[PDB]
Write a protein that binds this ligand. Structure first.
Ligand SMILES: CCCCCCCCCCCCCCCCCC(=O)OC[C@H](COP(=O)([O-])OCC(O)COP(=O)([O-])OC[C@@H](COC(=O)CCCCCCCCCCCCCCCCC)OC(=O)CCCCCCCCCCCCCCCCC)OC(=O)CCCCCCCCCCCCCCCCC
Ligand code: HEA
Ligand code: HEA
Ligand SMILES: CCCCCCCCCCCCCCCCCC(=O)OC[C@H](COP(=O)([O-])OCC[N+](C)(C)C)OC(=O)CCCCCCCCCCCCCCCCC
Ligand SMILES: CCCCCCCCCCCCCCCCCC(=O)OC[C@H](COP(=O)([O-])OCC[N+](C)(C)C)OC(=O)CCCCCCCCCCCCCCCCC
Ligand SMILES: CCCCCCCCCCCCCCCCCC(=O)OC[C@H](COP(=O)([O-])OCC[N+](C)(C)C)OC(=O)CCCCCCCCCCCCCCCCC
Ligand SMILES: CCCCCCCCCCCCCCCCCC(=O)OC[C@H](COP(=O)(O)OCCN)OC(=O)CCCCCCCCCCCCCCCCC
Ligand SMILES: CCCCCCCCCCCCCCCCCC(=O)OC[C@H](COP(=O)(O)OCCN)OC(=O)CCCCCCCCCCCCCCCCC
Ligand SMILES: [Cu+2]
Ligand SMILES: [Zn+2]
Lengths: 161, 495, 265, 88, 116, 196, 151, 60
């Protein structure tokens, strides 16, 4: 016999409360040292090994908490947090696109070359054409990612049914 | 004993309890506030005296610039958000909705220790390393990136500090939203939650939307410094940097202020023995201020060369955001009437000062909203007067209301009312003597971020000198009062 | 209040504590040179006031069982800080005794303590400092969950008919009752055993074992909860409003000689 | 802390009485919420001395022969303890 | 729309309301035996009582309490959520009082862990 | 390990403080039987208890034998609405004729003398005692309230305090507008003076 | 607070406390029990307030040091590090606050003085002489201190 | 009536607290004003702030 508490996940103490901050601190000081002396204080592979090892704690605790501490309230909390994280990633991409397109939407630009018409056969498409951007391979990669999206959606629905 | 020492360290380092994390946030916030106050006293002593009395060189004014920048950053990011949001947000939010802990308990500890690593990097970079960053809290390029006095790794470490502070705030915001949405006891609808909870929710929504843009801007600065790109150099757009930064910037100030409104409303309900007048109106005004704040960011950029139609639009939007704040002020004034607020309470008198100073600061900032009139008031001491009579005379007094209210509840000892009265009255008078003159100094034409001024501006700085002495007295009284709070009697005899 | 602890070691002119307070906060030369202004009367029991409040009392001081109660250790605090303490306490005890000497079988006694105060904010109902873990076993339960829901509005929100919300089929069956009795050759079906909410009456009172069966005596402690921000009390069946107003007038009239010689400045 | 329980001074020549005792004091600061001050005038007692003084007032004021109680110094004052009610 | 709905019949003029000294409002919480119960109103059970926000209450369990704001008698009480250790050994068919008797005796005498 | 507690019996802690026993608090070191059993000594009380206990046993046995061995002549099944757990109580608590009114008036007079005034005085003492507990610098007693407070209803307050205040505010608004415009420009409708 | 191991082991599911034999902290790393004592936020205050005492007594050196470290420790550490890193700044501050550094002051001159009223208005200002030199406390001004030339 | 002349006990103010408070705060403000005047009359200055310079500059 056990005494049943509220549905809320009470919570456990964990080392992840300081390990992740220490990981961030390590990464940033590693960058600072690489900037100052142009050399690595610790091998990059060793650093990535430490980073990976620190973060293996999440799947273990996840497994053992799903086995024991889970219900629909907890699941809803987790799914809403997942949604907010996806939103944050979308905003990050929006910010970087803002960074990219700032100087491209503003059409006028001071260029080292000529882009007026009737002076050469190709000048009139100098500013409006970056003809090296690997378009064919980009389309191939697009096809690959469409494959992944469609297959994953199909399988997800299939198992859900 | 090793076991006892390890138990204490683990108690304060492995914790995922909202109360413990709240008190940790409060302690760190107060310490950061005191450090910023010390730096501000150094700034004021530099201003109060003629002939570069402290730096003694024109080549060494970079020390003064470091002072202003670190003062701004410390006081904004490390003092008022850890106290306003981190301290009472973690301590109270689960208690008011009748739950045990916030959702994602581990992310709370992660957030606090991210704040701590940020503070550590910042202090070590700006104290133990030579020639720190000297570009104001708005790290405008190319001063931040292409400048002789900004070449060391201290600048890069400061930028990474900004990154970690942003990460911590985002984690806290997500946690608050999730906990308030799903963990309410049965029978409590979403809009019937305590008003402080709603203000925390809207603040969290503000932080989530804007911080990634600041992250992008700061990464742009880092890349300009290190990868030697031209994002913001002569072939770049420093105006682009400003747009990104200020798209983050104004939501930040509304994030700072809204939780103070929530706390003030809660404490008023507690100490006047009457409910808020127009609770629904106050909540809707809070959310309206939160949403409108995302469309006004460029009112900080009326002189960089915006389009004239954009200037008109941004002045219009600033007026729109002015409206709901007026609604809230009227609601407070009518709430206090017909109440039974305690007549000898530091909380009551701090609320009075908060209300008056916030109305004054709001009016001064509404003058700045007009684009045309901002031609004469940009980068003068009028702007400093504005955002100091708001931040340092309204937000601070809201936190003083919370301090003088919640201490008897967190520690279980009453408050020395006369001592606290000395502290609060001298803080009010001393601040009003420092900041108020700035307004009339801004109109006369004095520029900000300068250590040496023309002879025409003597009277303003003499009044500022008077105010600085009063402020020193007041803050010493405050710290001594708190030390006396936790100390037993020191004299006792027989009568 | 405050417990001075050891008076002896704090009376000395020069002390480690006084010097530490001077360095860090709470003491200074202003106390060494001008004690009459910054120490002055100090904080402690007022013997003269205790004597005055004692000698102003009536013979109630003799007839009160206060000095044998567990709260007898607070006699000086309440004699000093509660003018007319003994007469009010005597009225309180005589009220309890007259409730005890009633003719009713159940003697209800009102209980008021620190928990008798309601609040709109949950953190005000805990003892300070707050426990480490709060609301472990869920949050509050609202009494309103035991009231009939707004059926009409509930049907209307869903776009249901709700025409016959007040017209229900009658039910007369033996299968719907679990509590059966035989009363003079009549088999009466009435009620269903619900559980813990059917035994509220017995679990709330304690019997007097010596009282006979034909003259039972039960003791019940009725808790009282109030807002303290209302200014008007509604006791229900326990005390009528007119009686309460009468008691207010009489209480304010009697407890006036204890209050008239002081100013609130 | 431990001092004498409250007593009654009585002046034999003028027959003039009055209660007295040691009342400690200390520098005033913040109080404590979870503490009701105990009996600091008559330590370790249920505070019956108020009742004893109330009962003894009639006897003392009427007039009492104070030859059976110790004197105070070399003056005309005597100490009457309040550990028990006074009846004479 | 609710304040102008009609009463159903004239019973309310004769019967004893819900919340009388003889027909109290009994409510049930979960917790530990003897722990004070958290209960509350949504406000305005009376014309003179506040209704802006919910008002909470801390009350001893299994005792008759009276709210003298509204005048309502209530019986907040606790039922402990004692349940079988959920590790897959729970019983699949009707169980009797013997094993339960042992577990309950141990819980009353010493107590049992919390599902946290 | 220190002093581990033995067993799990009730202890008064932060989460639970128990149900006070006011009777023992009040009747401390004083007997209760002189009030519940006036005029009887301990031996008489015990003898009476024994006699009544045996009598009650006999009556209970008779009643159980009767109810358990009686033939059923009628079956009474009350009417209730479907989905309703229990039937509505057929007892009304309101007097209907004048004789019931007189009966309830006599009961009310007795209850007032013997059950209501005691409650009133106990509650008044409780309020004063709470004041005393919070007095002395511990809490905020005397900072507001008192018996001299002027309590007004919603209608009275809005009619006699709110509207006049807003009226004065409006008049101040207009007067200040005109005076400030004159002060700055030196005219009332012509902008700056000696300029246009 | 004392441990609850007796009740835990004799309780209802003893198998959950077998880990207590291993390296474990009972308050932090053990399953809570229905009979466990209530843990308060600040145990020092929680235990001192009901007795009437404040948590820290200034007479005890350990208490005085602990409270000082809580209230003043970090600020003093920051100030000490700043003084060590920037010793000239505090030297200049000390010189100015003690009337040792006068930028371009001269003996017997009168200097403008005006409290408020906006910018320097010749209809509000006064001129003041140095009381230190009027009282004979100062007769010369130092010239070997640091001087902001090229200002 | 307990406590000192300038301080009370806990959450109680001393008798006539507010007049005393105003008087003491006025005294503190006066002392601080004196300190400001002293630091301006004896602290650093510039050759351009002298009476001769300022009066010759004001005229035109
Ligand atoms: C060099 C020095 C070397 C050591 C010298 C000897 C020890 C000196 C200190 C001492 O005596 O401590 C024992 C002393 C306890 O001894 P005790 O008082 O005799 O016994 C108490 C009982 O055992 C238990 O009783 P308790 O639980 O009631 O505890 C007493 C109570 C007493 O507390 C109080 O009275 C209240 C204080 C907190 C207030 C919170 C409420 C909101 C704010 C209110 C306003 C006041 C603010 C503060 C004052 C400002 C002025 C007004 O609480 C505390 O003392 C805890 C307060 C929190 C302090 C530490 C929090 C973690 C660090 C946060 C960041 C610090 C700044 C970093 C800057 C970079 O204090 C502690 O043990 C506190 C915890 C210390 C460990 C913290 C966890 C480890 C942190 C490591 C990382 C640090 C930063 C990164 C560094 C780089 C990587 C490593
Ligand atoms: C929340 C933010 C905050 C706070 C609290 C303050 C507080 C103060 N600030 Fe400043 N300040 C800024 C934000 C803040 N400031 C920003 C963003 C800038 C711009 C930087 C830039 O220009 O680049 C700035 C710039 C700035 C300047 C610029 C000078 C120059 O540009 O020419 C000056 C000088 O007068 C100044 C003075 C002060 C003073 C005298 C105080 C205080 O001394 C007055 C009030 C004092 C208080 C007492 C508050 C301290 C509180 C503690 C004691 C902690 C205890 C906790 C609580 C009381 C709850 N500040
Ligand atoms: C928490 C801090 C805080 C708050 C609440 C605000 C609130 C406002 N702020 Fe400001 N602000 C800052 C912090 C804050 N600000 C900081 C730190 C800076 C400097 C950044 C930097 O440059 O370094 C800054 C800079 C800043 C500028 C830059 C000027 C310049 O840089 O050129 C401007 C101008 O548009 C501005 C406007 C406003 C407005 C219009 C409000 C409004 O919210 C105020 C509205 C309030 C009211 C209007 C009061 C209610 C009025 C009534 C009671 C009714 C009256 C109504 C009518 C007459 C219609 N702020
Ligand atoms: C699911 C997530 C996907 C994320 C990826 C992006 C999705 C597409 C939508 C992104 C919208 C937000 C980012 C862009 C907004 C900022 C643009 C900018 O730089 O504005 C400043 C520039 C102006 O720059 P400027 O004129 O001040 O100067 C340019 C720089 N110099 C000085 C060197 C000349 O443009 C504007 O201000 C225009 C008005 C703002 C609104 C722009 C809307 C763009 C709509 C794009 C539609 C097509 C999208 C799909 C292809
Ligand atoms: C300055 C820029 C600011 C914007 C940055 C935008 C980029 C994205 C930033 C994401 C940080 C915020 C995360 C929000 C919550 C995500 C979901 C979540 O935490 O779920 C709960 C869970 C943990 O929740 P829990 O352990 O607290 O418990 C919840 C209860 N249970 C477990 C029962 C459901 O999160 C994870 O497991 C995290 C994933 C593991 C791997 C990644 C670790 C990252 C740690 C965070 C710091 C990263 C720094 C870089
Ligand atoms: C120099 C003027 C005051 C400057 C301070 C103004 C405060 C600014 C707001 C921010 C507060 C910051 C901290 C404040 C610290 C303490 C401030 C302070 O001095 O407060 C106390 C001051 C002065 O209080 P006081 O002097 O009236 O106190 C005397 C009152 N009794 C009887 C209790 C001793 O506060 C106020 O007066 C504000 C409320 C005004 C209401 C006036 C009622 C008069 C009192 C009753 C007398 C009898 C009837 C007279 C008829 C009425 C006609 C006038
Ligand atoms: C809900 C939140 C909505 C936030 C965006 C609101 C935008 C309102 C319109 C503002 C606007 O038009 O700003 C114009 C400004 C550029 O103006 P300017 O450079 O002066 O001149 C035009 C070009 N010559 O434009 C810019 O500076 C850039 C474009 C506007 C900002 C784009 C933001 C995209 C969304 C980001 C995530 C929002 C998450 C919430
Ligand atoms: C008559 C007064 C002057 C007497 C002689 C000079 C020495 C004075 C004592 C020095 C130590 C201060 C006293 C101790 C204390 O607790 O101070 C708190 C007090 C705040 O209140 P206060 O300013 O006194 O208000 C009434 C006006 N006297 O004061 C303060 O908080 C002021 C700031 C701290 C001052 C002390 C600084 C360190 C020690 C020197
Ligand atoms: Cu803004
Ligand atoms: Zn109610």
């Amino acid at each position: 016999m056990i005494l049943n508490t509220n549905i809320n996940y009470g919570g456990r103490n964990s080392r992840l409360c300081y390990l992740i901050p220490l990981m961030v601190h390590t990464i940033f000081l590693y960058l600072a040292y690489l900037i100052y002396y142009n050399i690595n204080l610790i091998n990059i592979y060793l650093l990535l090994i430490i980073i990976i090892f620190i973060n293996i704690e999440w799947p273990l605790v996840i497994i053992y908490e799903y086995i024991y501490l889970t219900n629909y309230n907890i699941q809803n909390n987790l799914l809403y947090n997942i949604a907010t994280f996806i939103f944050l990633e979308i905003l990050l991409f929006i910010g970087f696109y803002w960074l990219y397109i700032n100087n491209i939407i503003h059409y006028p630009n001071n260029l080292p070359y000529n882009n007026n018409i009737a002076v050469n056969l190709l000048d009139h498409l100098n500013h409006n054409n970056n003809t090296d951007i690997c378009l064919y391979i980009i389309l191939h990669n697009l096809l690959l990612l469409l494959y992944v999206t469609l297959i994953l959606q199909l399988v997800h629905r299939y198992v859900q049914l | 004993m090793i076991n006892n020492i390890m138990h204490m360290i683990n108690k304060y380092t492995l914790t995922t309890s909202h109360k413990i994390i709240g008190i940790l946030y409060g302690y760190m916030g107060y310490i950061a506030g005191i450090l910023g106050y010390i730096i501000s006293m150094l700034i004021r002593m530099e201003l109060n005296t003629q002939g570069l009395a402290i730096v003694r060189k024109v080549k060494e004014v970079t020390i003064y610039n470091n002072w202003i920048t670190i003062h701004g950053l410390i006081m904004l990011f490390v003092f008022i958000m850890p106290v306003g949001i981190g301290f009472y947000g973690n301590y109270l939010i689960p208690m008011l909705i009748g739950t045990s802990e916030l959702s994602m308990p581990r992310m709370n500890g992660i957030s606090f220790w991210m704040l701590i690593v940020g503070v550590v990097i910042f202090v070590i970079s700006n104290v133990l390393m030579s020639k720190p960053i000297s570009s104001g809290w708005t790290l405008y390029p190319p001063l931040s990136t292409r400048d002789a006095d900004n070449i060391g790794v201290n600048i890069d470490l400061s930028l990474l500090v900004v990154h970690v502070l942003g990460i911590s705030s985002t984690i806290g915001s997500v946690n608050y939203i999730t906990t308030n949405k799903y963990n309410r006891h049965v029978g409590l609808t979403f809009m019937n939650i305590n008003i402080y909870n709603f203000s925390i929710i809207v603040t969290s929504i503000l932080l989530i939307g804007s911080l990634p843009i600041l992250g992008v801007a700061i990464t742009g600065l880092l890349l300009d410094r290190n990868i030697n790109s031209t994002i913001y150099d002569v072939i770049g757009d420093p105006v682009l940097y400003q747009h990104l930064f200020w798209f983050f910037g104004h939501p930040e100030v509304y994030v700072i202020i809204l939780p103070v409104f929530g706390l003030t409303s809660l404490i008023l309900t507690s100490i006047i023995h009457k409910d808020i007048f127009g609770r629904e109106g106050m909540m809707y005004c809070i959310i309206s201020i939160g949403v409108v704040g995302y469309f006004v960011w460029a009112h900080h950029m009326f002189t960089v060369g915006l389009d004239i139609d954009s200037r008109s639009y941004f002045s219009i939007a600033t007026s729109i955001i002015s409206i709901p704040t007026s609604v809230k002020m009227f609601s407070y004034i009518n709430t206090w009437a017909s109440g039974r607020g305690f007549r000898g309470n530091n909380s009551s008198w701090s609320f009075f000062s908060f209300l008056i100073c916030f109305c004054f600061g709001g009016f001064t900032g509404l003058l700045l909203s007009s684009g045309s009139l901002d031609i004469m008031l940009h980068d003068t001491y009028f702007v400093v007067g504005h955002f100091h009579t708001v931040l340092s005379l309204a937000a601070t007094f809201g936190l003083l209301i919370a301090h003088y209210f919640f201490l008897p509840i967190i520690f279980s000892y009453s408050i020395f009312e006369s001592f606290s009265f000395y502290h609060t009255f001298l803080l009010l008078v001393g601040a009003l003597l420092v900041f108020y003159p700035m307004h009339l100094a801004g109109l006369s034409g004095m520029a900000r971020r300068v250590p040496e001024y023309a002879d025409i501006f003597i009277p303003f700085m003499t009044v500022g000198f008077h105010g600085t002495f009063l402020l020193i007295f007041s803050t010493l009284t405050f710290i001594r009062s708190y030390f006396q709070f936790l100390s037993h009697i020191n004299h006792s005899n027989y009568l | 209040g405050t417990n001075p602890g050891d008076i002896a070691l704090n009376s000395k002119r020069f002390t480690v504590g006084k010097f530490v307070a001077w360095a860090c906060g709470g003491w200074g030369l202003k106390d060494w040179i001008f004690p009459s202004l910054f120490i002055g009367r100090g904080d402690g029991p007022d013997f003269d006031r205790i004597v005055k409040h004692t000698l102003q009392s009536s013979s109630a001081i003799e007839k009160v069982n206060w000095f044998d109660s567990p709260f007898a250790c607070y006699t000086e605090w309440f004699v000093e800080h509660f003018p007319g303490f003994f007469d009010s306490r005597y009225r309180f005890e005589m009220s309890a005794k007259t409730i005890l000497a009633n003719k009713y079988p159940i003697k209800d006694f009102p209980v008021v303590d620190m928990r008798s105060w309601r609040s709109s904010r949950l953190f005000d109902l805990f003892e300070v400092p707050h426990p480490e873990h709060t609301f472990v076993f869920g949050g509050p339960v609202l009494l309103n969950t035991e009231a009939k829901r707004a059926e009409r509005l509930e049907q209307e929100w869903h776009g249901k008919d709700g025409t016959f919300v007040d017209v229900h089929p009658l039910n007369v069956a033996t299968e719907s009752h679990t509590e059966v009795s035989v009363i003079g050759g009549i088999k009466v079906y009435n009620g269903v055993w619900q559980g813990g909410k059917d035994s509220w009456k017995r679990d709330s009172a304690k019997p007097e074992l010596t009282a006979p069966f034909h003259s039972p005596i039960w003791y019940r402690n009725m808790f009282i909860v109030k807002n303290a921000d209302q200014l008007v009390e509604h006791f229900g069946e326990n005390l009528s409003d007119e009686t309460w107003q009468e008691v207010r007038k009489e209480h304010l009239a009697f407890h006036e000689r204890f209050h008239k010689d002081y100013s609130f400045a | 802390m431990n001092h004498e329980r409250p007593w009654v001074f009585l002046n034999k020549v003028t027959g003039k009485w009055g209660a007295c005792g040691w009342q400690p004091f200390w520098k005033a600061t913040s109080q404590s919420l979870n503490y009701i001050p105990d009996n600091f005038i008559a330590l370790r007692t249920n505070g019956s001395w108020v009742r004893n003084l109330w009962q003894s007032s009639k006897v003392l004021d009427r007039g009492l022969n104070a030859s059976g109680y110790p004197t105070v110094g070399t003056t005309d004052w005597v100490r009457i303890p309040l550990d028990a009610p006074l009846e004479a | 729309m609710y304040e102008d709905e009609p009463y159903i019949g004239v019973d309310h003029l004769y019967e004893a309301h819900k919340g009388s000294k003889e027909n109290p409002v009994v409510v049930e919480a979960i917790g530990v035996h003897g722990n004070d119960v958290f209960t509350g109103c949504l406000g305005g059970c009376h014309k003179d009582a506040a209704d802006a926000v919910a008002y909470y209450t801390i009350v001893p369990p299994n005792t008759l309490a009276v709210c003298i704001d509204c005048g309502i008698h209530f019986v907040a009480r606790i039922n402990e959520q004692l349940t079988f250790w959920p590790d897959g050994t729970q019983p699949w068919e009707k169980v009797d009082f013997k094993a339960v008797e042992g577990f309950l005796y141990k819980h009353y005498k010493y107590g049992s862990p919390l599902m946290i | 390990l220190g002093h581990m507690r033995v067993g799990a019996l009730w202890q008064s802690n932060a989460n639970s403080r128990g149900l006070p026993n006011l009777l023992k608090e009040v009747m401390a070191a004083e007997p209760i039987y002189p009030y519940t059993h006036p005029g009887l000594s301990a031996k008489q009380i015990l003898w009476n208890t024994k006699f009544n206990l045996k009598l009650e046993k006999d009556l209970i046995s008779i009643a159980e034998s009767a109810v358990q061995s009686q033939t059923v002549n009628k079956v009474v099944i009350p009417t209730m609405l479907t989905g309703d757990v229990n039937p509505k109580s057929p007892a009304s608590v309101v007097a209907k004729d004048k004789y019931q009114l007189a009966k309830q008036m006599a009961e009310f007079q007795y209850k007032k003398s013997y059950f209501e005034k005691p409650w009133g005085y106990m509650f008044a003492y409780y309020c004063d005692e709470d004041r005393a507990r919070l007095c002395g610098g511990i809490g905020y007693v005397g900072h507001h309230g008192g018996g001299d407070a002027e309590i007004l209803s919603y209608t009275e307050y809005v009619s006699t305090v709110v509207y006049p205040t807003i009226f004065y505010m409006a008049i101040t608004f207009v007067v200040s507008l005109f005076l400030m415009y004159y002060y700055i420009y030196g005219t009332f409708f012509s902008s700056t003076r000696n300029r246009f | 607070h004392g441990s609850n191991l007796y009740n835990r082991v004799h309780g209802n599911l003893p198998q959950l406390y077998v880990e207590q034999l291993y390296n474990t902290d009972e308050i932090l790393d053990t399953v809570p029990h229905s009979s466990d004592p209530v843990h308060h936020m600040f145990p020092k205050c929680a235990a001192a307030s009901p007795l009437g005492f404040r948590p820290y007594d200034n007479n005890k050196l350990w208490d005085a040091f602990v409270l000082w470290a809580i209230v003043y420790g970090v600020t003093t550490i920051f100030c000490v590090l700043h003084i060590l890193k920037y010793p000239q700044i505090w030297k200049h501050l000390f010189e100015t606050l003690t009337f040792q550094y006068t930028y371009q002051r001269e003996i017997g001159e009168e200097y403008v003085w005006q409290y408020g009223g906006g910018g320097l208005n010749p209809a509000k200002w006064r001129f003041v002489k140095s009381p230190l030199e009027e009282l004979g406390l100062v007769t010369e001004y130092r010239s070997d201190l640091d001087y902001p030339d090229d200002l | 009536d307990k406590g000192g002349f300038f301080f009370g006990v806990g959450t109680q103010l001393p008798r006539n607290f507010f007049p005393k408070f105003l008087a003491t705060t006025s005294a503190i403000m006066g002392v601080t004003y004196g300190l400001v005047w002293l630091y301006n009359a004896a602290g650093p200055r510039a050759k351009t702030q002298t009476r001769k310079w300022k009066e010759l500059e004001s005229e035109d």
